[PDB]
Each structure stands twice: as structure tokens, then as C-alpha cells.
Write a structure and sequence with these properties.
The chain has about 170 residues and is of the alpha/beta class. It contains six helices and seven strands; from the N terminus they run ββαβααββαβαβα. The two termini are about 25 Å apart. Bound molecules: the ligand O=C(O)[C@]1(F)CN(c2ncnc3[nH]c4cc(F)ccc4c23)CC12CCC2. It catalyses: Thiol-dependent hydrolysis of ester, thioester, amide, peptide and isopeptide bonds formed by the C-terminal Gly of ubiquitin (a 76-residue protein attached to proteins as an intracellular targeting signal).
């Protein structure tokens, strides 16, 4: 038993809710919240900009130190940093950005990072401003992640479409 509430169950291990991931994280304080990061951990907009804003920019300060020490992430890669006031940990995961021409096959590699964590609160990778089809992203998530994932979808219209088209 865990504290996630109001989710629709899609599969044995994947759940979905129309929710603002920032507000969901603030209430649940999950062990892991996933950020839709870029390789530079520049949290300007989308999910990343919203998560970072909710931390009063502490996520960005920590991220800049991480990059100064380690250099950029790989597309499809991840790093674990603090969850600040939102979660114990933040798993920063880089899905491919279609608006940068990155290979969509890397979306599966991105979701594989989730398997290193037993339970996660997450957005759909490569959705939103990353330009991928969220229905495809949901399919890859279901077919790749084996650990327990609670997907927060900000847009109600999109959430209803994801549920109604789910196979
Ligand atoms: O940034 C993108 O492209 C996204 F569409 C944004 N998404 C979100 N998902 C779940 N809760 C969210 N709260 C927010 C508050 C905001 F001000 C802005 C975006 C969100 C948001 C998923 C996405 C990241 C991969 C695709």
C-alpha cells in the first residue's frame, strides 16, 4: 500500500491521473519524482521549469553544480539528485526532444531508467514541449517500465484521450 490516490490503473504496474505533478509531489512527498530534463539540466520550461520553480530555484542551483562537475547527461540517460521540498529524490531523465531532431527510439532507453526505482511519480517522457506523441510515449512506458509508475498528466483533455485510446 502507498499513498497515491485517484489514479486509474492501466496495467499491473502503471497508473495514470489528471494532475499537476508539482501539486501531486507536494502532497504525496514520493520517494522519487521524475523530471523531464534536458542534457544540460537547464530547467526553463515545461515540467522542468515548473518543478524547479516550486523549489525556489534550488533544483537549478544543485543542477548547475552537478553539470560543472560531471558534464552533460546523455539523451536517454538520467541522474539522481535531491527532491528538495517535493520528494526525497528527483530522477532527472532526458527523453529525446523531437523539436531538436533527436531519435525517438531513445525514448525506450529513457524509460529504462525508471526500472532502477521501485515506485515513481512521473510525467510522460518526451511529451509536452519535447514534441513527441503522448500516446506513443504512454505505449513505450507501459512496454518498458516494470516498476510501479504513477503518471501525472497536466492536461485534462489529453488525459481523457490517453485513457480512451489505451489498448
Ligand atoms: O514540458 C513539457 O513538454 C510537458 F508537456 C509538461 N508536462 C507536465 N506533466 C505533468 N505535470 C505538469 N505540471 C506542469 C506545470 C507547468 F507549468 C508546465 C508543465 C507541467 C506538467 C509533461 C511534459 C514534460 C514531458 C512532456
Amino acid at each position: 500500500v502507498n499513498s497515491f490516490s485517484g489514479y486509474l490503473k492501466l496495467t499491473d504496474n502503471v497508473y495514470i491521473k489528471n494532475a499537476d505533478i508539482v501539486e501531486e509531489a507536494k502532497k504525496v512527498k514520493p520517494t522519487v519524482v521524475v523530471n523531464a530534463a534536458n542534457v544540460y539540466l537547464k530547467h526553463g520550461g515545461g515540467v522542468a521549469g515548473a518543478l524547479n520553480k516550486a523549489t525556489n530555484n534550488a533544483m537549478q542551483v544543485e543542477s548547475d553544480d552537478y553539470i560543472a562537475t560531471n558534464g552533460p547527461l546523455k539523451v536517454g540517460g538520467s541522474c539522481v539528485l535531491s527532491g528538495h521540498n517535493l520528494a526525497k529524490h528527483c530522477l532527472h531523465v532526458v527523453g529525446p526532444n523531437v523539436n531538436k531532431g533527436e531519435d525517438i527510439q531513445l525514448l525506450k532507453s529513457a524509460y529504462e531508467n525508471f526500472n532502477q526505482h521501485e515506485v515513481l511519480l512521473a510525467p510522460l517522457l518526451s511529451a509536452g514541449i519535447f514534441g513527441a506523441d503522448p500516446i506513443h510515449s504512454l505505449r513505450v512506458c507501459v512496454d518498458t517500465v516494470r516498476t510501479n509508475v504513477y503518471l501525472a498528466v497536466f492536461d485534462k483533455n489529453l488525459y481523457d484521450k490517453l485513457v480512451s485510446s489505451f489498448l
